[model samples]
Target chain A: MSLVEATLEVIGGKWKCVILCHLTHGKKRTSELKRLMPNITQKMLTQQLRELEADGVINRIVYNQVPPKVEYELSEYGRSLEGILDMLCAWGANHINR
Target chain B: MSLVEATLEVIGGKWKCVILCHLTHGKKRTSELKRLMPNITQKMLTQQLRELEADGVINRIVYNQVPPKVEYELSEYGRSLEGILDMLCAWGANHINR
Candidate 1:
């Protein structure tokens, strides 16, 4: 796998980077992420989260409770992506404005 | 569109970034890129290039020749992507070796 290939596999979809952006600051449970991200189908979010998890870009943690709880956060590998994400986001922000 | 969505649209697919990688150093014609990238269907490559061009990340040049020479080169916008692609490919290279 080339570097482009590897990095892209982690953030290649329509929603993965969007999901990662919300997690950059801290962890969020599945419910909160769903709430925060408008217009995302639960099915789409889960699929991308699973891909990110499989790529080592995010972690899934479960807590025992009545209904059970699940949380998602950036992994160490995921954290390493903050700079690039920020840059890409900033670039996009500026471009759209222009 | 948000920052994440806009950027992903420019480089989301499997072949866009791969095509961009080969354009980093210098200009190459259509056939050259085809030869350089193995295992990519001609159909897929053409689709990705049109997307990249539409996104302003690449320029398509037509040369007057018997066979109608066409060259693909990174645009100013596309050239700006060199750093990100370099980082991505490097990250992938290191990950694969490990």
Candidate 2:
């Protein structure tokens, strides 16, 4: 495995793409991510986020407050992934329906 | 979700990257693929190949003979994926160990 291998290793999981795509909009809380990706379990989402964070593809910010707040956004390296995702998305749009 | 979305939808799965990476070397038989990807189950390999074929990322050639001869190779679209995979591999080499 290499960097390309590492990226695939990280983002290649089932839920990472959905999470990345949603995060493309902006920083999002864990609950919001779950809302957007209804098929994902809470544990799985946490695991995915942790992986993304470890890989520097996503930034996890934890806030200390009465309610507690955590949000995730793409890191610079993570932001670079947008270009590849854009290409894939364009390819998919032309070929797939639904 | 769009073409970018669709590509992610296809390649984002856990096993697809391993399959694509191996196929990058050359056409391979199901059993050989299994040998290379020891962790993957036969059923899952079949399923992943079917999905990749459906997405036009792989060509499944089934020879007509006394013994079944099935081989998988990358299609043109699939070949294009090599560029992205290369970039990712380079990135991984820079950022990760093992």
Candidate 3:
């Protein structure tokens, strides 16, 4: 298989692309992301994020403070995927009406 | 999920996009496809081709004779996927070095 196929397989699932698309806006806490995608279960969200983290596409940082805190941001390698993901998103959105 | 995710899911598999990418080159017989992708099994190629046909992304034509002649080409809908698939292929190729 080629590299794009590998990337696609890694990002497989209904919401991985959606998950990453949201992060491109800026870093957000786990709860914040869940809020943006209200229907996503905490279980599912964490699972997808973990995969993205494992792939080094997203950075997960844990804070040492009260109530506990964590934030997620796209890594540089992950950032490389931004343009194509955007195109992927755009194509999907455009196909909706046509 | 969204339209793009739906599209991705439809085309999901080891060889669907690769098959589509090759179809973008020109029409070819099933045997020709097998020759082009030496590693793919006949069962896998036929399965992927059927799925692509079901998705309206490919056309399969058969000619009657002593031995049957079959040709596969991209349909208009399938042709629409060409540009994006090309982008996908290019990105994958480019990502190999970096």
Candidate 4:
């Protein structure tokens, strides 16, 4: 496969697109993500996050605190994917009903 | 959202990338496709083809015959996607072990 194929493979899934879509705006907390995507199960969300993180598409940050706050943001690589994400969102909004 | 996103949504799947990747080379028969991708079930292959056909990526040609011959070739839109597909294939070949 080529870079485009590999990129698609890494990002292709039922929910990864949506996840990346939301992150395009800015950083988000796990709870915030859950709230935005109410349909996704917690387990599945975590799994997808881990996958994205592994692919260097998203950054996982754990703040030093009593409760330990964790935040997710698009990495440089992840930001690079915004162009594709924008294309996907535009298509979905126009073609598929939300 | 943008065109890139739309394209990804249309093609994002377990096998669509591979399917499109093969079609990049040339036209192929249903049985020939089955032979190349031995792991894919006939049903799934059919479904993916239908989806690609719906997306205007792959052309499905039905030959008028006794045995019912069907051939699939990339359309103009599909051919246009070769640039992205080549990038994907290169990324996969270098990064991911087949």
A28-51 in candidate 3: lDDT tens per residue? 898998988776799989988998
Which is the better candidate, 2 or 3, if ranked by TM-score?
2
Best by lDDT: 2
The deviation in Å at residue A47 for candidate 3 is 9.2
For each candidate, give its TM-score against the true structure.
0.84, 0.86, 0.68, 0.78
lDDT of 4 by residue, B1-98 (tens): 44444555577766787888778778888788888877689999999999989988889998899888889999886675665555555555544652
Ranking by DockQ: 1, 2, 4, 3
For B1-98, candidate 1 gives per-residue lDDT tens digits of 56677767777656678788888878888778788778677787888888888878899999888868888899998777766777777777766664
lDDT of 2 by residue, B56-95 (tens): 8899988999886999998877887776676666656656
Give each model's clash number: 4, 14, 0, 21
- Model 1: fraction of the reference interface contacts it also forms: 0.66
Once fitted onto the true fold, the runs of candidate 4 whose alpha carbons sit more than 4 angstroms away are A1-5, A86-98, B1-8, B90-98
Q: Arrange candidates by TM-score, highest first: which order?
A: 2, 1, 4, 3
The residue pairs in collision within model 1 are A3-B88, A3-B89, A3-B92, A4-B89
DockQ of 2: 0.58
User: Candidate 1 or 3, higher TM-score?
Assistant: 1
TM-score of 2: 0.86
| Each prediction's DockQ against the real complex | 0.60, 0.58, 0.30, 0.37
Interface RMSD of 3: 3.2
Q: Please give the lDDT score at residue A6 for candidate 1.
A: 72
- Report the C-alpha lDDT of model 2 over A39-68, residue by residue, as the tens digit: 779999999999899888999998988699
Docking band of candidate 2: medium
